[PDB]
């Protein structure tokens, strides 16, 4: 977490995120292998 508060996602710090549906202040990476990213 730390980009908004706490999250439950296991994966973190993905290199980059393209514009995506849903999302947060820092959109997370696609869960389909989840992934807070940036």
């Amino acid at each position: 977490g730390c980009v908004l508060g706490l999250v439950n996602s296991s994966l973190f710090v993905e290199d980059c995120k393209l514009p995506l549906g849903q999302s947060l202040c820092a959109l997370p990476d696609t869960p389909s292998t989840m992934r807070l990213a940036s």
């Binding site: 730390c2 908004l4 508060g5 202040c25």
Partner: protein, 41 residues
């Protein structure tokens, strides 16, 4: 765009290095009561 882009024109929109000096100033002048994110609790 670099600090010396104006050269003879003291444009203060030079990015200080992202949030250029004038963005700085005006956003500073005003007063915002919003709490900082990630620290509200």
């Amino acid at each position: 765009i670099i600090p010396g882009f104006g050269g003879d024109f003291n444009l203060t929109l030079l990015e200080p290095v992202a949030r250029s000096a004038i963005e700085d100033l005006l956003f500073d002048k005003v007063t915002i009561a919003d709490p900082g994110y990630m620290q509200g609790y």
